[PDB]
């Protein structure tokens, strides 16, 4: 996982961080997704155990407990594709998508 972004299909596991300078996003053990120094939280403390942050192919951020039950969702959705949730240096977590261009250094093209 990248240090400051999350891609669709990826998981920010329990006690995992996304960090950009002083802004520290934590998917906590108590199920609360907290953006430290960013005055933002999902407000889902004690709503489950072994909670994980995912990003759907429609650009929706989802918090699921250990059994895979949805605890919280960002609600905003767009077209099927590849999205990226980025911790902006000004202290906002932003979902961007879908992908419109890619540089591929793994294939000569």
């Amino acid at each position: 996982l990248g240090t400051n972004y999350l891609l669709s299909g990826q998981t920010l596991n329990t006690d995992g961080h996304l960090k950009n300078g002083d802004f520290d996003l934590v998917m906590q053990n108590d199920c609360n997704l907290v953006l430290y120094n960013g005055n933002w939280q999902s407000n889902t403390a004690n709503n489950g155990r072994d909670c994980k942050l995912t990003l759907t192919d429609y650009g929706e951020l989802v918090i699921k407990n250990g059994d895979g039950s949805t605890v919280w969702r960002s609600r905003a959705k767009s077209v099927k594709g590849n999205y990226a949730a980025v911790l902006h240096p000004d202290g906002r977590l932003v979902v961007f998508g879908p992908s419109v261009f890619k540089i591929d250094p793994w294939v000569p093209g």
């Binding site: 400051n4 929706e60 998508g97």
Partner: protein
């Protein structure tokens, strides 16, 4: 202006004079010789624009198009990935791909 993050380039931000994005061993450099070069992956990548202009710069606009302009605003290279109006981000990912995502569909604030 927006503060810089080593692996990110947001809409409006500019790279030039060997300014670059880095992630692990990967580097995406807007070189002084007007060539945009990705050093990394297996084969790397280049815009193949060495000497096509002077004092060139890279800029991601608010439609998701990534462009190399010279000192006189002559187009040197373009991603030709123009999409919906909004905020975009170019990410030099940990896996070597440099991907443009947008528009922004959700934010914490």
């Amino acid at each position: 202006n927006i503060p810089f993050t080593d692996n990110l380039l947001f809409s409006g931000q500019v790279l030039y004079g060997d300014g670059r994005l880095t992630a692990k061993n990967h580097q995406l450099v807007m070189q002084g010789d007007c060539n945009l070069v990705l050093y990394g992956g297996k084969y790397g990548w280049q815009s193949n624009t060495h000497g096509n202009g002077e004092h060139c710069f890279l800029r991601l606009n608010h439609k998701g198009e990534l462009i190399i302009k010279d000192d006189d605003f002559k187009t040197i290279w373009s991603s030709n990935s123009s999409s919906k109006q909004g905020d975009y981000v170019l990410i030099l990912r940990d896996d070597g791909f440099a991907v443009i995502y947008g528009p922004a569909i959700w934010e914490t604030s």
